[PDB]
Design a protein around this ligand. Structure first.
Ligand SMILES: Nc1ncnc2c1ncn2[C@@H]1O[C@H](COP(=O)(O)OP(=O)(O)NP(=O)(O)O)[C@@H](O)[C@H]1O
Ligand SMILES: Nc1ncnc2c1ncn2[C@@H]1O[C@H](COP(=O)(O)OP(=O)(O)NP(=O)(O)O)[C@@H](O)[C@H]1O
Ligand SMILES: [Mg+2]
Ligand SMILES: [Mg+2]
Lengths: 466, 94, 123, 37, 469, 466
């Protein structure tokens, strides 16, 4: 049956049907248009009229324009032929490499795994990053979130994690660009074709790319995540493999939701967001998961608007994570990269029965001395360090070498650090710190532990300083 | 941040600020930095150092107050803005 | 209630001393229980303790019998100790519960164990 | 503004501390003296 | 006249009358329920439809259900026969002790006593609480406000005021539970039953109970305050006799209304409270007062959201009191109870020409040295106890003692402190602080004054303290 | 065309015109009232109904009461005969000196000069007041933020400026009392009469007064700044003058705006101001610049909310300022008049490319010597002013000569001060301070520079006092 547009406001389009009303989520195709314009049915307004959301610009639409009911949600290609390709919200290829001939197609909307499909296996995923490896190890099959403010470190980190992890990965990965910088996809795409994780000739590619950058309208940015998500689900279930799913900024999925919620006729919730922020988010995050049928190690970059971690968006994101890496501008401004907050990043894997007592005991040693140094910062700012006991000065000193020894030069950032990248092993990181704590290096200067790999390179740099 | 808390730290640091500036003068007239520090670990000076210490301490507090107050107003503006949006959402919901 | 007597305000009162930490031996002491009891309160998961087992260890701390021990050693001690009471002294615990009270003979048989066990521990 | 310092933390625990510490010994100091008298 | 329900959204139900339209404030009986369900007419929406707040749950109402206009506002049983009985919001007995066979019923809604009806008499009411009677004395038949953030001592304090003043009261006393914990209702009931202030076998009971706690929908909590007030009204007028009115947390009267405002179609005001916040509180408070016909000695417990006294609810409640005792987390935290703020608790009779000059001077003398001590809190916060001239460090040492001497064990708080509640006579209180301000007890340790009765026990305890060392 | 009042809700009135509908901003005349009640159009609600904001009380109005479309917006008397007279919001004389017999009339709502009508030259409006002309020059056709409460020389500096600009520039002046207090409005009137700027006898008046009393509704208080603006515009576009516009409390204009906005039911923006804040400030502020014909410079008194410079009101106002004259009690006490702070008052135009390199280096030297002397204060008092090197003893001295030379006797003070006021040309001030800085006048006593005019009167005053 034929539906007709009866109203258009930005990205919300009301379509009235005279016969056969399209159910919610059903994807309607707008007629009379140059490129495919999909509307997603969001609600039944009554009077045979449905309110939808456009997956692309709605410029040019005219009331009375015909809209077709595809009879199903937004279905995208899933399968091995997606690998090495770049697709948009609605699964159309955008890498100028022609149709994506997959057998199966998949709806980008699906129910999350049931409670009986849940996995309880915890097994660390060492990353080579001392701060993450140490204080809040990532977990294979786990949900890693990387919170960070504008320009703090999310991207570079996700990139390093793709370097230090993805490459040494035996399986398929899915990178979902959501509301970020298009030239970044550009960067990523060409960095992958280089390293070879993407192959344009032989069919050996291992990465599937879904993109809906900050140039896209709210409806897209609001669903791209589900698309990348859906492409990851195929690899997990319909193939039972270990799937890596990177998503640079899932916060954009929520932000986008707010733009359209406005137009949908919803009274706004706290801070202007939509009422459905929590649920909307749940029905998505819950699909990003490991089941008994397969695994998904997801790494999600999370933007903190106005650097406010209490903002409904990020706030609401923590409960969905198995591991959190909180980046701080204050730390970044002291030139500590990655600007990871030693005292606000967590991992369900930070358990002695899981990473050992030596690992756990050092981790807590570090979060204790830094915590104790942090509580002294009040006194240091007013009365300097001449008003601290002899004991205090000692911790302050070890904290400062620990803080710096937490930094690390990543390959993906060599241009800004002016140092060759470093990949530190786990034992080496445990060791390095056990030592700084035990006072073993209380004779070396702070600046010696800054921007270095293992502890050994902390010493080398010390001699050079003489 | 909370207006109640910021207001607490500002007052408290404005106070400290006043007391430290007063001590800098007394010293001037006559905690003394790392003076007693050095000799133990191993007047003119004593007062010198005390002058210096309170001085810096005085600045360090003012630079701190100067930063709390900005946070004061930012946060002051935000609370008003919040209270208002709440007030209207209810009205536009009627 | 007996050993937990007034440990609570005492702990919160240790916090009053916490702001300092050439202390006078006296206050050095207020800061000596609090650092000890604290370790005795730490615990492992999925391994709850019978109210009698808890009293036995809390007793060892609250009655000052561990005041001349190294904090960091407290935890390793609770373990050894407990495993001892629970092993050799089934009957002792067997009482405290039955009477949910630390009787004279029980306040004695416990001072006997912590102080000697403790010392053998600091060998 | 009278006692803002104390109505906070960092330097409050200090004021709180020195405080109690002082009157702590003092009183003991006054304590045995009571006996004398 | 019979009406039909036409809309049910929460505690707000719309009833349409075809016959006659009931006047606002009229109670409406919802037919077809195994439990009396009262609907109070709040507004006239127009087109023969009235909007009403339910005095109970709406779980189960049906559009079109019948509603019988009782003809008048909520009328509850009043009179001596209420004494010892726990009443509802609509007069229903909730003690399972059967009906309250009363011969008179009053409307919980009524006009406030005229101005010509006001009494200007003020006689200090002694409470045995040193701080109270010292700094901000209560007054006979006055309005007492007890402010306090969550769990600082509102409930325990008001309890002491009943164990002290009510038990030794030659007359009736009303207690209304306003949106608090039902468990506290249990406690208070059985504890009054023990003390014998309530008799279940005869007619010597001297306190009436009215409850509408937390588990209750806002509508009820929004009126119980007026219910209890009505019961105490009858005891003030139809007798003239002295009446004591205890309301545990009048703040639940304003929250109740804050929980149904929107649904009554009202733009929200500052901080989400109702626009009618101050006037609702007004037509409610003005009623709780002493007239020339009789006197009400009211003690209201007032909650303070997040501890912020500037919050509209509490800030609007002050002027309604003749004496305020403010509690302070800060103080409670220093283990001082009652956690009364010496610098924020005031009283109307705190005048030298009402308590005499001796009583007044000492009070202000306390307050001043305590304000000076706050000024040194800062100075010593950076310097240490060794810089204050022997003159200042002397006051610091007295502040501590005067501070600690304001604390006092409550008979009602034995189970908490573990000590024996003491009760201090006024005169022994002034003497007590008169001497400490004098410098007399500068040789005694502070601890000697912490948690005691008259100034003597201090010395005594101080002695028990010397010998133990 | 005649309308009929169909809606009155406070200062808001909706009128229904059956045939001809009055455009937005068009003044309507209410019929049947003692005084004149003007309703300024604001919106076309539809159904031949228009909404408006009353310029005076609305008590007495009745639904159906007749209303007349004045054909255009609020027109007021313009031209010479307005000077010395006190005008109302709508053009009515309120000085009771009868009618304001003018042949001309103008609308208070006029678009700002077009881009071509713009001056591209940066000229400095000489005030003859040393500190001003030397440390914070008034951009001709620029806005200057007058900072300082009351009792600091405000009313005197305002008139003096009126005088000087008149004597040395031929241009008149207008005073728009936005949200003025009837009390100070009265005080100002007579204080001006006894100062010469206003003459109730011979047409020698140099200023036109326009008032917007506080008892006047937000609608009224919002338009005054424009009424007074329209008045000043006549003298710029008709007599080619370089007018001077005084807006005492530009803030209360802003606030006046928000109240209108709210009354009209618009959704407030951050901090409760009007969404239109910047545009309300734009449309008006932009009518103040240099045109090919002449120019209007305006001194607007500013109120910083909660002492917060970032608050919307001021921050929206600082976008339109070229200078700030800061009055200071600290200065007023020392007996220094005008009590203009030489270090807090500033100018955008204080640039070499604009005020000449010469003028620049002088203003800079004076700013730096004061800065140097202001620091020394500590040492001088504590460490004693006895161990001051040669370079340290001259600074303090010279600075003091400068600091006092910054004082100037106003011609409008003659009435009381008993001292001939002085009007210093830019040339004299530059050289005056230029020399003092050199040291040419170090062999003179301080009081020699206090309260004088050109540098000459400094030496002449020196010998007399020996
Ligand atoms: N590991 C790092 N080493 C050195 N510099 C870093 C590192 N991480 C971040 N930076 C610096 O911060 C800049 C940008 O960080 P980037 O990875 O783009 O942040 P982001 O979290 O993605 N922010 P954004 O996308 O703008 O919200 C880089 O240009 C670097 O200067
Ligand atoms: N006089 C007192 N002596 C000792 N402890 C007290 C005293 N008063 C209150 N407390 C303590 O504080 C607790 C509860 O105080 P309570 O009187 O119920 O506070 P509240 O103000 O009524 N709080 P709430 O109504 O929940 O906001 C008690 O359980 C005690 O631990
Ligand atoms: Mg990024
Ligand atoms: Mg309570």
């Amino acid at each position: 049956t034929t539906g007709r547009i009866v109203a258009v406001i930005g990205a919300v389009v009301d379509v009235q049907f005279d016969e056969g009303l399209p159910p919610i989520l059903n994807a309607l195709e707008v007629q009379g248009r140059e490129t495919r314009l999909v509307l997603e049915v969001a609600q039944h307004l009554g009077e045979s009229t449905v309110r939808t959301i456009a997956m692309d610009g709605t410029e040019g639409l005219v009331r009375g324009q015909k809209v077709l009911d595809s009879g199903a949600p937004i279905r995208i290609p899933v399968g091995p032929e997606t690998l090495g390709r770049i697709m948009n919200v609605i699964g159309e290829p955008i890498d100028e490499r022609g149709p994506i001939k997959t057998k199966q197609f998949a709806a980008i909307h699906a129910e999350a795994p049931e409670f009986v499909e849940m996995s309880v296996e915890q097994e660390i995923l060492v990353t080579g990053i001392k701060v993450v490896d140490l204080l809040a190890p990532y977990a294979k099959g786990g949900k890693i979130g990387l919170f960070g403010g504008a320009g703090v470190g999310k991207t570079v980190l996700i990139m390093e994690l793709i370097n230090n992890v993805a490459k040494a990965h035996g399986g398929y990965s899915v990178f979902a660009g959501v509301g970020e910088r298009t030239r970044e996809g550009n960067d990523l795409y060409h960095e992958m074709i280089e390293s070879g994780v993407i192959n344009l000739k032989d069919a050996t590619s291992k990465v599937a790319l879904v993109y809906g950058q900050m140039n896209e309208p709210p409806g897209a940015r609001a669903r791209v995540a589900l698309t990348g998500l859906t492409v990851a689900e195929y690899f997990r279930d319909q193939e039972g493999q270990d799937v890596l799913l990177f998503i640079d900024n899932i916060f954009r999925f929520t932000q986008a939701g707010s733009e359209v919620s406005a137009l949908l006729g919803r009274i706004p919730s706290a801070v202007g967001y939509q009422p459905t922020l929590a649920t909307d988010m749940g029905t998505m995050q819950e699909r990003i998961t490991t089941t008994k049928k397969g695994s998904i190690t997801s790494v999600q970059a999370i933007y903190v608007p106005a650097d406010d971690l209490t903002d409904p968006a990020p706030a609401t994101t923590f409960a969905h994570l198995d591991a959190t890496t909180v980046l701080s501008r204050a730390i970044a401004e002291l030139g500590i990269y990655p600007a990871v907050d030693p005292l606000d990043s967590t991992s369900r894997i930070m358990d002695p029965n899981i990473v050992g007592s030596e690992h756990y005991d050092v981790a807590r040693g570090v979060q204790k001395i830094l915590q104790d140094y942090k509580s002294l910062q009040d006194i240091i700012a007013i009365l300097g360090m001449d008003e601290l006991s002899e004991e205090d000065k000692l911790t302050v000193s070890r904290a400062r070498k620990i803080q710096r020894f937490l930094s690390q030069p990543f390959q993906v950032a060599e241009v800004f650090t002016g140092h060759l990248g470093k990949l530190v092993p786990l034992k080496e990181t445990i060791k390095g710190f056990q030592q700084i704590l035990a006072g073993e290096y209380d004779h070396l200067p702070e600046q010696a532990f800054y921007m270095v790999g293992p502890i050994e390179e902390a010493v080398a740099k010390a001699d050079k300083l003489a | 941040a909370t207006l109640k808390d910021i207001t607490r730290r500002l007052k408290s640091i404005k106070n400290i600020q006043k007391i430290t500036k007063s001590m800098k003068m007394v010293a001037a007239a006559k905690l003394c930095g790392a003076i007693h520090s050095s000799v133990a670990k191993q007047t003119t000076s004593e007062q010198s150092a005390r002058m210096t210490a309170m001085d810096n301490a005085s600045k360090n507090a003012s630079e701190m107050i100067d930063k709390l107050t900005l946070t004061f107003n930012r946060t002051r503006q935000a609370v008003i803005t919040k209270e208002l949006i709440e007030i209207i959402s209810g009205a536009a919901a009627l | 209630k007996q050993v937990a007597g007034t440990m609570k305000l005492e702990l919160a009162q240790y916090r009053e001393v916490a702001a300092f930490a050439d202390l006078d031996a006296a206050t050095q002491q207020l800061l000596s229980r609090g650092v000890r009891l604290t370790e005795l309160l730490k615990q492992g998961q999925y391994s709850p303790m019978a109210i009698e087992e808890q009293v036995a260890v809390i007793y060892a701390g609250v009655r000052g019998y561990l005041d001349k021990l190294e904090p960091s050693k407290i935890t390793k001690f609770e373990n050894a100790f407990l495993s001892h009471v629970i092993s050799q002294h089934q009957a002792l615990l067997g009482k405290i519960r039955t009477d949910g009270k630390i009787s004279e003979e029980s306040d004695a048989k416990l001072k006997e164990i912590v102080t000697n066990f403790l010392a053998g521990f600091e060998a | 503004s009278g006692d803002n310092v104390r109505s906070s933390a960092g330097a409050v625990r200090d004021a709180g501390g020195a405080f109690g510490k002082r009157e702590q010994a003092e009183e003991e100091r006054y304590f045995r003296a009571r006996a004398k008298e």
